[PDB]
Scaffold this active site. Structure first.
Site, short mmCIF file in Angstrom:
data_model
loop_
_atom_site.label_atom_id
_atom_site.label_comp_id
_atom_site.label_asym_id
_atom_site.label_seq_id
_atom_site.Cartn_x
_atom_site.Cartn_y
_atom_site.Cartn_z
N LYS A 1 0.88 -1.28 -0.01
CA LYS A 1 0.09 0.02 0.00
C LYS A 1 0.96 1.38 -0.15
CE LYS A 1 -2.44 2.85 0.71
NZ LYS A 1 -2.88 3.77 -0.81
N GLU B 1 7.76 1.53 12.09
CA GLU B 1 9.14 2.41 12.25
C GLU B 1 8.44 3.71 11.86
OE1 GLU B 1 12.27 1.36 11.04
OE2 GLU B 1 12.09 -0.92 11.34
N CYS C 1 14.16 10.25 7.94
CA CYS C 1 13.63 9.90 9.51
C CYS C 1 14.89 10.00 10.35
CB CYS C 1 12.70 9.15 9.89
SG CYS C 1 13.52 7.55 9.21
N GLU D 1 9.83 16.60 14.87
CA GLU D 1 10.33 16.26 13.71
C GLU D 1 9.56 17.20 12.54
OE1 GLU D 1 9.02 12.63 11.59
OE2 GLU D 1 11.11 12.02 11.22
#
Ligand SMILES: NC(=O)c1ccc[n+]([C@@H]2O[C@H](COP(=O)([O-])OP(=O)(O)OC[C@H]3O[C@@H](n4cnc5c(N)ncnc54)[C@H](O)[C@@H]3O)[C@@H](O)[C@H]2O)c1
Ligand SMILES: O=C(O)Cc1c[nH]c2ccccc12
Lengths: 495, 495, 495, 495
Positions: free
Chosen positions: D189, D265, D300, D399
């Site tokens: 996906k 994750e 990330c 972030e």
């Protein structure tokens, strides 16, 4: 698909390399001496092969050591070593027809076996080993907070590999795969009865990207260059596949020289145990004949002792005789041939003498028994069966290394086990039964490095292979083979 | 805490067992012969010890084989073998004061060392190995859907263990822990210079629950019963700790007899490398002193070559000299003593001969160098240091096995490494530096089984211990020790 | 050996601790509230137990975090953590009779089971886990020469453990063994139906040498303090054993709060498959009975669906009925009793409701089916069997957690497998056959965490235990349990 | 080597597939709906992509389940699965230019990064994982003689993989490699912001020999088809890479549905710690700028918090500013470009709002700070640095996922560690120091799944990758990634 005529034409059109290979180049032996490489197919001269001695061993080891110390291969990144080993395997496959043909001409096995079993078997050992390199992890110990304890593996340095003639390329690759993958330099010492494929792949290693000096090849006699490598003071490790008698001598040489590590794969007298409740007797019969006739019975895991439960013996032995009858000696360069020539006259006379010994000690000949196809100028023997064999008979105790089957009976599992373990050997064994408990318990009780259940000659690159007792020490194939070519180091760091 | 007079009273009041032990009973040698076991402490007769020969080896191996085959220990459940081994270790600790005293009287090491290092070390080897037994897992291979591939380990059967005199009980336990834990029967052959503790613990094994026949002990000479075990046709494996000369002979014996597995822990000439940026020079100095003086320098991993970066040499050597001055020979039964007697007169003469060789070859004596305390009737030598040593000198190349330190200098890390690896040995090494890259890269470059960083004599039961090159093959301690006492089996099952 | 009257005297003479335990001291809940802990044996008040809530969770987590950060346990040397855990286990065994009695009084299982199964099982979990600590090794990757790649494991920090009432002490130890061994602080939350043994062992942990704050225990309700722990923002991991309904809720709580790791051991409807060629039908019958009747059928892996090949069904079912007849409810304090009381009235009503559902859905009652011994003031039900069960029926699909067996039939192995896997659960399964292929292939096809062959309720501390599908995630016991309490770290160092 | 003009021509000449892929064929969504796939390069329309919903999830899962049960892939021999995965990787490389171009057009990263990093990174994940398949071994427990205990791994069945847009192909392959290698069916996906490479490789999988139904691809929105997969009652496992917020929602969905395993994750705020004794400050400065500017800081593990020892701060920050200046946004289809466009307007406005927040909370802008190249019709932002940042500031805690650097100072190691761990995240960290002790001890103290020493962004396929705390659970890459896609089974066999 190539015909007999195609293979015969190809055999005629080969140019065959016979030189040794040191530091990236083919070379004569220092003495300039050669020995004749003769084909057991018909007796034709294949090549004059360099006959190396101690001086050549010295030069190959100096080359090996220098290459190892340079780090060109020994300190190359794991993922790059993997890539090179996989290309090396690929070049075996790309050159499969020539390599298969060399093997068949060199030692007499059927071309369809060379092409279908040996070459792919060899390539698979190189690529699988290469694939494994960066899948291996070393260890970090559980230690106090102010300590870091590393347990790592390092290549030993210079490896001598001494190999036999029954599966020349494949046995070579069983050593080369793990030895090279771990970063060692290797001096390969092929059998004088089958030097040609080893000589040829030295060049392919270079083409794959193996640095000069990392793989050197020294054709020649066991008692000259072979002995010299085993006694060499700068060889770290010798790995060996061959007879039990010579395997023992290597231990002695190591003790006389430098305490080099010694890893041995030696002979066998493998028991093939068929119980009355085997799931498929026909399968067991086919496999029993295959187990002794395949590669002319020049297989150290040959199922040379067939142990059969007495209640099925009368039904089973005719099934085995019938199955064995489909294995027929013929021209090795004919693709249809499933049994080839024996490697030479010396080998054939040994086998014939054992067949004579079968008669002498009281066994009953029920199939084969004679030399055939003399007119060809080659050496061939019928697959042979002796019935009514007792385990104390010579053909029951001694490895014959020809297509000679001994048939023994038992009436209890415990007796089957006692008979099966009654040997100085322990390379392999097989057990045929449909019963869960009896299968696992009998397998557990057999003192052999490989135990096959409801099949014979099982396992692939994932299965360690080697002997108990006088069949050797250490294992080829699997990840366990790597341990033969490395040293453990405990690095204990105070923080 | 016991005083000197307490230990002397206890020494007087020991009754000391001197017999061999076979099939659960103490026994005389078949010949009835004995040898005198004399203490190096003062010279007293400790016991008349059974002097076994080939006939005793035969009886002990027959006992070992029969015990093995019965399954009483070899097929005992893992969790039950674990509990027994832990009880075995517990009995050593319960009997620590007697065992330590036997060790000290038998070979002269200080009583505080025997009690604080050897006995706990031996017990730890037995209990850690036992604890590990049911934490180990064998393997299942990735196979096609109609195959089950098992890769399991099995005890080899009968193990001979031949050990030295410098750590009598601890070295025996290093072998016994894993050999017994894996289910083997063991025939233990202690040094004729230190038979007493091995003889004593044979009985403790029975009390722990080890079955009769599983642990037999044969005191006697190397060239008689030792050789007989190494040559025995029904011994599967020999493990050895001792001199490189004898280790090699064992390989020869195995080749002459039955190709038994041979695992060797041999000599060493371990380099202790101190860089100018060591984080704690005093710690480095204290460790350098301890590494040569502990257990009278009768330590296989003694830091006998001290390599010092030239720019700190002038500062560091006086620190090493002062540290070594705290290590003083004395009465081994005094708990305050940190340096004991050498094992015998022969050993002292060897050490004095090497000291003389130091002078001869041109080194500079800067500490010690003399025999002392002659009036005691015992054999004692001052911890000694030679400065200005070149790696080609005899005292730098040859294992001395006394408290004699050789001091060498270097200017670059590369030079340090070249000198460190310039030896036939490879048992241990150490590196002292505060620098991350230099620490790991130097450690990686050192060809030695153990590398200690910013410490010396590190590691515990989690750290594999053993040699590169002529320092041996295989490892003691950790889980890797178990592999010396088992065989791999591949069971490939068709479904 | 203690008699019934002995146990009854001992029960009377217990002083029972009911407080929570935080930072090394027993304590009331912040609110001062308690709940009544009532015995199902007869109905007596055992203790008024602290009823913790969110404020207590907060205090216990703060205590856990601070203990963790201090390193008192989390940075304690591996060998020291090992020794402490083994002493902890030793204290459970030293206090076995009291702990067993608390368990029996608290939730009604027979005293001979508490003493013979639960307490030793719990101790074994603590000691085996401790023994394993310094046998574990982390990893070093195969990297280029200028890299060192470490792959190590570290404790997660603060662990919440939430456990059920059917094996109170044993289930807690399954969590505590590995969670504590890896260095974590643990907040333990016992079932409100069985808080007593968890409360008691908090003190034994301190006595063993576990530091204050490292093990806190919070009795109280699931929906109060349980939920508070699962929602707490400074809890790193929650491990759970209990119902599938609550297990799911825990995942939701973790998603709503801080993404803590969630490890679940949930319900089951385990199929026990008996083929016509089972080697020992009587053993199979005895096991089938035990698998449903042991611990009153309040067992997550109870063999609640008995699948029988139709050709032996008529012979086998009467054998199962007779075997089940030896399992008789009785006074839990009588050592002769093999079936005890259900945990409470609510549980008995659930069981009776399912028995009624069995009738309703059309199964045939062939044994048991009734409540008994009402006059005792305790809650007891006859072990029960329904024949003619279809897998679509409620008693075949839904976990009953009582001694109610459903018997289903099949004609082929394929059908047996289809019915076995026709469930949302997947905790365990069993197969009974003498056939090698059928045994392994059927076992391989069963979607369950544990598969037992020719036995039921097998495995020990070496066997990972846990669910496929909605029976949970992750495993208890073995070395694999440790991975639930640690995190992987990759340290890649350039040299 | 291709020029800008070549890439622009190629971009124009692509025909771009936009359909979903189910059971071996491209297909529209059941509703027939599409969403526009728009390039952030200049705003051109790449394709109308199928917008899948719950109905398509149902069909893809039915297809996945049926394929898994057929055994076409799930029971294919390990060595054949290996071969197919390696061919799959090979087809990525053979189609590298088209795949690289799709990625660059889809989400805006520089073509030289697509070609040089992403495509080879993806292929390497597929082939390494494939290579590993038959190098993995399961376990055989240490058990009593009448037991055989197997501990094996089996594929979970149907895996949903939900992936983000910053490394579309590579992140997909990080999941696909191990998930497919272990035998699972996978429903992939891709992000709605970058569906094109996932859509395209569905066809390549088929060409490699992956059976129909084993790999299905459903483009569409997270809140439609993504959510539907996560809530599906027949998906066994969902693996996810994305934001922390959505990661938590998946845990909730699993709890609401079927307790499927959830592996996450998520985000990161990785600390890059530079000590005054770093071995190479210039290297540390280059890496610090690279750590934040590479892939537009849409990484990330971006080194978004630079922690610098105060004594080198004044010298070091200008070095970082200078290094950052070599990273310049430009046309992504130009091979010379090293910083591309941000993925879209939404992403760019988030980054700009964080830059505004840097000013607001009191930080000092010392480089970059503005949007640029507006005229292109694309979205670009200058790599940006804020100095004088405190760890409580928003740009320090949250972030940003754009090229925005926060600079923080410390004066002790302990403070550096406290600051570094002061975050809900724990994905990665780095440490720069030449000191052995400080390197290992600081690394050990950092609560992050990856710790890089004297480098940034280290590790290869051998290094597990994933988070502590709210950065996720489980690991990608290495052999450890396989455990996410398999279930443990303990098969306990009574003999
Ligand atoms: N995996 C295995 O265990 C395995 C495989 C194949 C064959 N074998 C055994 O090998 C034997 C095949 O016959 P063979 O004639 O090749 O065995 P062999 O022992 O006579 O010769 C094997 C190799 O050792 C060399 N060699 C001979 N004498 C030597 C010496 N003194 N010093 C050093 N090297 C010496 C030989 O030149 C040859 O290369 C059979 O017994 C077979 O059982 C074992
Ligand atoms: O092998 C030896 O010489 C014994 C030995 C090696 N390391 C040791 C540490 C402590 C005590 C004895 C030894």
């Amino acid at each position: 698909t190539l015909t007999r005529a195609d293979w015969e034409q190809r055999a005629q059109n080969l140019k065959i390399e016979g030189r040794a290979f040191i530091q990236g180049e083919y070379t004569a032996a220092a003495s300039g001496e050669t020995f004749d490489c003769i084909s057991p197919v018909d007796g034709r001269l294949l090549a004059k092969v360099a006959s190396c001695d101690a001086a050549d061993a010295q030069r190959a080891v100096e080359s090996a050591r220098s290459a190892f110390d340079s780090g060109a291969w020994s300190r190359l990144a794991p993922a790059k070593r993997k890539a090179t080993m996989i290309r090396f395997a690929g070049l075996l496959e790309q050159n499969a027809e020539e390599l298969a043909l060399l093997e068949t001409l060199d030692m007499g096995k059927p071309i369809s076996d060379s092409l279908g079993v040996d070459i792919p078997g060899g390539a698979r050992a190189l690529s699988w080993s290469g694939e494994a390199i960066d899948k291996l992890y070393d260890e970090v110990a559980a230690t106090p907070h102010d300590q870091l304890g590393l347990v790592t593996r390092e290549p030993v340095g210079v490896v001598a590999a001494i190999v036999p003639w029954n599966f020349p390329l494949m046995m070579a690759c069983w050593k080369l795969g793990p030895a090279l993958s771990t970063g060692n330099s290797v001096v390969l010492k092929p059998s004088e009865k089958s030097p040609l494929t080893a000589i040829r792949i030295a060049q392919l290693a270079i083409e794959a990207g193996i640095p000069a000096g990392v793989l050197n090849v020294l054709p020649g006699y066991g008692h000259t260059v072979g002995k010299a490598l085993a006694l060499h003071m700068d060889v770290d490790t010798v790995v060996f596949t061959g007879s039990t008698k010579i395997a023992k001598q290597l231990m002695i040489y190591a003790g006389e020289s430098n305490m080099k590590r010694v890893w041995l794969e030696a002979g066998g007298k493998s028991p093939n145990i068929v119980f009355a409740d085997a799931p498929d007797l026909q399968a067991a019969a086919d496999s029993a004949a295959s187990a002794i006739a395949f590669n002319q019975g020049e297989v150290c895991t040959a199922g040379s002792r067939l142990l059969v439960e007495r209640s099925i013996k009368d039904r089973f032995l005719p099934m085995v005789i019938e199955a064995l009858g489909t294995w027929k000696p013929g021209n090795p360069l004919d693709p249809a041939t499933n049994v080839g020539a024996l490697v030479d006259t010396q080998q054939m006379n040994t086998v014939l003498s054992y067949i004579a010994a079968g008669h002498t000690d009281g066994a009953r000949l029920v199939a084969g028994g004679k030399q055939i196809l003399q007119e060809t100028g080659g050496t061939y023997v019928e697959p042979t069966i002796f019935d009514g064999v007792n385990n104390a008979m010579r053909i029951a105790q001694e490895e014959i290394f020809g297509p000679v089957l001994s048939v023994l009976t038992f009436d209890t599992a415990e007796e089957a086990i006692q008979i099966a373990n009654d040997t100085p050997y322990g390379l392999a064994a097989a057990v045929w039964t449909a019963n869960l408990s009896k299968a696992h318990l009998t397998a557990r009780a057999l003192r052999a490095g490989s135990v096959w259940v409801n099949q014979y000659d099982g396992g692939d690159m994932t299965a360690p292979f080697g002997g108990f007792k006088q069949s050797g020490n250490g294992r080829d194939k699997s990840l366990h083979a790597f341990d033969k070519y490395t040293e453990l180091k405990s690095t204990w760091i105070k923080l």
